Nucleic acid binder design. Structure first.
Ligand SMILES: [Mg+2]
Ligand SMILES: [Mg+2]
Length: 1209
RNA sequence: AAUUUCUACUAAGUGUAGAUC
């Protein structure tokens, strides 16, 4: 009988690496320099990039051994089934499986033969690179035994040969890029054949381009395989584009000839598309500038492609609107906005057309119907200009409005060129430095942006076809030009990364000290081989590295008593008992030293001790006892570890025994070694010594330590059985300094420094010593990464999701933490009990820190506000944008802690937005990409949640962290449920009356006067109430469309309260309700004491009554009201009364402590996100224990409104 | 404006609060 969290400790193992600074002690650094130990590791760091290029060389020769040798069998059917003019009906589906097998055939041809094995293993730079193609053999030699360097590279490069359908894959480049273009050129070649003079075709082209083959050949389908390799690609593209001839001659390609057939001026005869060949900036101001000048000046090719695209689109009318497509996705919203004037128009017209087909007059639109229709829209690949014009009202030519938009964008590039013109002068020199030159950086960004946006907008004109009749006459010119234009993407990114860079560098290189096996392990004596160990003196820890000539130097050292002793590390990790107990104890040396029995041998060889229905408990137990006894009689192990074994009988399986061996097969304590003696070893350079350090080891550190500091100390604390452990794979790095100390910004001693937190009541600080910006980057820095194992031997095994459900099922009053992102609040929190009562509500705009019993807050929302003003003053430059992103990422590391306390405090489950059902809205300040990061870190922390201020052995302290979450997988996997975390859709959580569950499901925009009458008439009643001085609209959501989700159906709307209206004016004004009705009715001669006035109201003859009656109605249903300037109120008022008679205003809760209902609209959202989890909990309470794992949690809008409206009481 | 590293700091004077492969 305890808390639900109590059950979640020692569940699964987790591994982490702690980093530290390593401070060289004494003469160590001098010795390191004299003996020149470092430079070995530093040049390798230099030539790493060089060797990588040589690896790419052999890779490219390889790719071209497999590609010369390949004949695609799948191909010949594929081409046919491709240009079959589809005819669809999923007959094409047959083909889309033929496609995948084209990539399948390529991948397997790589893997299948001519080696491929020896490619990403140690033997590629050992021997293979040396035998392939002196100044290059030398660099590779030379990395022998240091093959570690290329592992990240090795992973990045094996993705080349997959069937992955990624732009990484060679196969994808072959079939889904080159082959569609190769096919599309056949059909161009067939159509455009006779244009070619015999003297033009094979004459100049066959001889000068080849003298082998003929031009006809490369437009035959069986010839494609020839064009997989780069030569055949160059040959092909030279046929199209042209060729230099090796003399000045310059042979025209096919495209020039088609061009020269402008003589018929009908023209618009399609040109061929070239084939994709396959397989920046950033180091200096002079480089960055050289690229900008070179790629973006007015006779660059990017600027050439812009002029061609200007010419192309100027003739947009000349082309067939039926054969021009716009890719489906964001480009559809945008172009809808630019063409018609609204986002959802295209989507809306398309929904109007889908309905008519799928909407049976039995009707009632349901959630699934809307989900399925949505799945259909998304699935649609693209829209022709013709189809878009099909939605085009009269008066509005879609092509022409598009022309004026595109042309406009090119004119904006040309004006921006004019403003940047001096930058492209041969004469131009950079006076200041780039990161000191805001003006230049802004000139560059302006131009880059205007071209990037042009590029990014024009990209929409494909539709990934895979499409029927395309206007190849348009897509010839377009594709020629756009492939060039696209180069701006790379340039943009590189230049931006360079400006955005920190003024310092974190570049570093791994240290082996001329030792391939340096520091592989710790725990055991292999210390003569690994040559690194760990020393302790008082509170300080040290890393000690023995010189090769003196490995044993640490061996022989007295226990002293001259009053000076480092403590010295030893003892032992027994690694993987399950592999290692049988490898030792069945080794013939042991099978001599011991007998053993043949009953034991037979059990092992057959494996009657494992699982898998050959299991025999007694056979298993015999093995155990054999091992147990073998353990008594094996010195190496029984003088190392203190084995305390469970009775053999209470072992159910063999893993039970193995865990105990693993658990006890690790010791760790300390030896004793003369301080004076090793200190001298350092002096003589027999030993190199570094202090392992972070600021928490400073003699002036008095605060609560870093979490990782605790982990590290706890490694060697008596109270740690239980358990954090030290692991091998430690690495030492060198980080060369990147700032010069004399050049740092400094706050000089004895002068007040302004304090920056406006909520810090102390205004200045005066210290008696100097404070330096970024000081740590002005010194060469050694850094030490040490791997640790947490909960290596878990006792509690179970499924975390199932256990959470079971405990919630049997919890009589489970609390839920709701988190929501808000408009006036970065994050807002609502804690709720098992019945929906709010227990705690507040904004997380302010993070309050504790040190002593002193509290100081930081308002991160004001920070973001000052930085957004900064971004405005700086004209949205890159660096402010990065500053805002990082601020937010900082903020979320603060929030993670606030959530952990709340979980611990209320034993509560967490309710979070599912971001894969993504909506989002411009007003919320934490965007999706930051929130996703937040949700990942929340998960990461809940793998091992720890409160730093708890005593470490206590549950929830550093040796007993809560594990209430499984390991992160991906963002797509952040849905449904991860342990204590539940992912909820935000649908209908903010705009809903938390006291009745009323949500506005009507559509109140004026459309027509008939529609308005129908609307008014669909109401049950409209009656002015004299007693309560109110108008009462009584409705039945049945008589209105798309209201299926509502549960109560019958709702009496009233007037009381007022509302804030946009009133887009000469954009804010406010409006009292029940007095706006009185006004309007008087205005039109309608006496309203006469109710039911529905019939009456419909007697009105002009739009003006109706247009303003509807606008009035919309406001009554507008529950959320906000001024935007004033932080005071973003309130919620509801047009419907509860069972006790008065209705809900937010301002009546707006100032209290933790009210019973939400205080503003931000709260309501976090409150309702939490209630959906209560709903989910409610489903658990309905299921049997063994069914819990199966219960669905994806609440539907209909379940939600039923719950919101019935549970309130 | 100090950091294993990050963000926000100065937090009582070479650092503070979270977080951190
Ligand atoms: Mg600290
Ligand atoms: Mg900083």
């Amino acid at each position: 009988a305890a808390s639900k969290l109590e059950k979640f400790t020692n569940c699964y193992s987790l591994s982490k690496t702690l980093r530290f600074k390593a401070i060289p002690v004494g003469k160590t650094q001098e010795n390191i320099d004299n003996k020149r130990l470092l430079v070995e590791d530093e040049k390798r760091a230099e030539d790493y990039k060089g060797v990588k290029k040589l690896l790419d060389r052999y890779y490219l020769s390889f790719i071209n051994d497999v590609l010369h040798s390949i004949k695609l069998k799948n191909l010949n059917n594929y081409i046919s089934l491709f240009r079959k003019k589809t005819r669809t009906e999923k007959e094409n589906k047959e083909l889309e499986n033929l496609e995948i097998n084209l990539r399948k055939e390529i991948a397997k041809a790589f893997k299948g033969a001519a080696g491929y094995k020896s490619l990403f293993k140690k033997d590629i730079i050992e021997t293979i690179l040396p035998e392939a193609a002196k100044d290059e053999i030398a660099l590779v030699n030379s990395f022998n035994g240091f093959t570690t360097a290329f592992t990240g590279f090795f992973d990045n490069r094996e993705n080349m040969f997959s069937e992955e359908a990624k732009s990484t894959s060679i196969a994808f480049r072959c079939i889904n890029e080159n082959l569609t273009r190769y096919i599309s050129n056949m059909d161009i070649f067939e159509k455009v054949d006779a244009i070619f003079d015999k003297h033009e075709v094979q004459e100049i082209k066959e001889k000068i381009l080849n003298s082998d083959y003929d031009v006809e050949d490369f437009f035959e389908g069986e010839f494609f395989n020839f064009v997989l390799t780069q030569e055949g690609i160059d040959v092909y593209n030279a046929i199209i584009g042209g060729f230099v001839t090796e003399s000045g001659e310059k042979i025209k390609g096919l495209n020039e000839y088609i061009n020269l057939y402008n003589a018929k001026t009908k023209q618009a005869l399609p040109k061929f598309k070239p084939l994709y060949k396959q397989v920046e900036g950033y180091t200096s101001d002079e480089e960055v500038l050289e690229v900008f000048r070179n790629t973006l000046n007015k006779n660059s090719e990017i600027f050439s492609s812009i002029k061609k695209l200007e010419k192309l689109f100027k003739n947009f009318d000349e082309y067939s609107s039926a054969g021009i497509f716009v890719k489906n996705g964001p480009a559809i919203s945008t172009i809808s906005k630019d063409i018609f004037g609204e986002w959802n128009l295209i989507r809306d017209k398309w929904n109007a057309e889908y309905d008519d087909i799928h909407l049976k007059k039995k009707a009632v639109v349901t959630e699934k119907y809307e989900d399925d229709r949505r799945k259909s829209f998304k699935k649609i690949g693209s829209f022709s200009l013709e189809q878009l014009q099909e939605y085009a009202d009269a008066d509005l030519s879609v092509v022409e409005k598009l022309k004026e938009i595109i042309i406009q964008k090119v004119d904006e590039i040309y004006k921006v060129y004019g403003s940047s013109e001096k930058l492209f002068d041969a004469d131009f020199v950079l006076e200041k430095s780039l990161k000191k030159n805001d003006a230049v950086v802004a000139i560059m960004k302006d131009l880059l942006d205007s071209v990037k946006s042009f590029e990014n907008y024009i990209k929409a004109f494909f539709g990934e076809g895979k499409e029927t009749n395309r206007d190849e006459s348009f897509y010839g010119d377009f594709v020629l030009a756009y492939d060039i234009l696209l180069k701006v993407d790379h340039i943009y990114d590189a230049i931006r990364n360079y400006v955005t860079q920190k003024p310092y560098s974190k570049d570093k290189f791994k240290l082996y000290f001329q030792n391939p096996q340096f520091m592989g392990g710790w725990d055991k004596d292999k210390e003569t081989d690994y040559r690194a160990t760990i020393l302790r003196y008082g509170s300080k820890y040290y890393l000690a590295i023995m010189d090769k000539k003196y490995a044993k130097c640490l061996q022989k050292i007295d226990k002293d008593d001259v009053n000076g002793n480092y403590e010295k590390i030893n003892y032992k990790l027994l690694p993987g008992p399950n592999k290692m107990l049988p490898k030792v104890f069945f080794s013939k040396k042991w099978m001599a030293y011991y007998n053993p029995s043949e009953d034991i041998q037979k059990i092992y060889k057959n494996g009657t001790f494992k699982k898998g229905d050959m299991f025999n408990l007694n056979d298993c137990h015999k093995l155990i006892d054999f091992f147990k006894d073998s353990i008594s009689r094996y010195p190496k192990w029984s003088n190392a570890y203190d084995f305390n074994f469970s009775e053999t009988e209470k072992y159910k399986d063999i893993a039970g025994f193995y865990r105990e061996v693993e658990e006890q097969g690790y010791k760790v304590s300390f030896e004793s070694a003369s301080k004076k003696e090793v200190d001298k070893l350092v002096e003589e350079g027999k030993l190199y010594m570094f202090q392992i350090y972070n600021k928490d080891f400073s003699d002036k550190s008095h605060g609560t330590p870093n979490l990782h500091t605790m982990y590290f100390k706890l490694l060697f604390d008596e109270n740690n059985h239980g358990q954090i452990r030290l692991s091998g794979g430690a690495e030492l790095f060198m980080r060369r300094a990147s700032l010069k100390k004399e050049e740092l910004v400094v706050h000089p001693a004895n002068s007040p420094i302004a304090n920056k937190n406006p909520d810090n009541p102390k205004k200045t600080t005066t210290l008696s010593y100097d404070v330096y910006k970024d000081k740590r980057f002005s010194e060469d820095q050694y850094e030490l990464h040490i791997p640790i194992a947490i909960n290596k031997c878990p006792k509690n095994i179970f499924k975390i999701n199932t256990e959470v459900r079971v405990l919630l099922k049997h919890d009589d009053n489970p609390y839920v933490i709701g988190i929501d992102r808000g408009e006036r609040n970065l994050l807002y929190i609502v804690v709720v009990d098992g019945k929906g009562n709010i227990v705690e509500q507040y904004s997380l705009n302010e993070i309050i820190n504790n040190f002593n019993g002193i509290r100081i807050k930081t308002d991160y929302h004001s920070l973001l506000d000052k930085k957004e003003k900064e971004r405005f003053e700086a004209r949205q430059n890159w660096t402010s944008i990065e500053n805002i992103k990082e601020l937010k990422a900082g903020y979320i590391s603060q929030v993670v802690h606030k959530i952990c306390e709340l979980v611990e405090k209320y034993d509560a489950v967490i309710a979070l937005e599912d971001l894969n059902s993504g909506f989002k809205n411009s007003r919320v300040k934490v965007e999706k990409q930051v929130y996703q990061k937040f949700e990942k870190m929340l998960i990461d922390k809940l793998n091992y949640m720890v409160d730093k201020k708890s005593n470490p052995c206590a549950t929830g302290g550093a040796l007993k962290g809560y594990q209430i979450t499984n390991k992160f997988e991906s963002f797509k996997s952040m849905s449904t449920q991860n342990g204590f975390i539940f992912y909820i859709p935000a649908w209908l959580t903010s705009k809903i009356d938390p006291s009745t569950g009323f949500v506005n499901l009507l559509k109140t925009k004026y459309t027509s006067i008939a529609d308005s009458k129908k609307f008014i008439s669909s109401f049950d009643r409209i009656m002015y109430v004299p007693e309560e001085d109110l108008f009462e609209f009584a409705l039945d959501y049945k008589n209105f469309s798309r209201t299926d989700a509502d549960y109560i159906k019958k709702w009496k709307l009233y007037s009381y309260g007022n509302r804030i209206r946009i009133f887009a004016a000469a954009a804010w004004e406010e409006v009292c309700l029940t007095s706006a009705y009185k006004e309007l009715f008087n205005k039109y001669g309608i006496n309203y004491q006469q109710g039911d006035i529905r019939a009456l109201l419909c007697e009105q003859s002009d739009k003006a009554f109706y247009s303003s009656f509807m606008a009035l109605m919309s406001l009554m249903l507008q529950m959320r009201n906000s001024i935007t300037g004033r932080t005071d109120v973003d309130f919620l008022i509801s047009p419907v009364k509860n069972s006790d008679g008065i209705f809900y205003d937010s301002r009546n809760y707006e100032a209290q402590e933790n009210a019973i209902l939400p205080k503003n609209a931000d709260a309501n959202g976090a409150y309702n996100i939490a209630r959906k989890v209560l709903w989910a909990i409610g489903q658990f309470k309905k299921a049997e224990d063994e069914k819990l794992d199966k219960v669905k949690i994806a609440i539907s809008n209909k379940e939600w409104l039923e719950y919101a409206q019935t549970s309130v009481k």
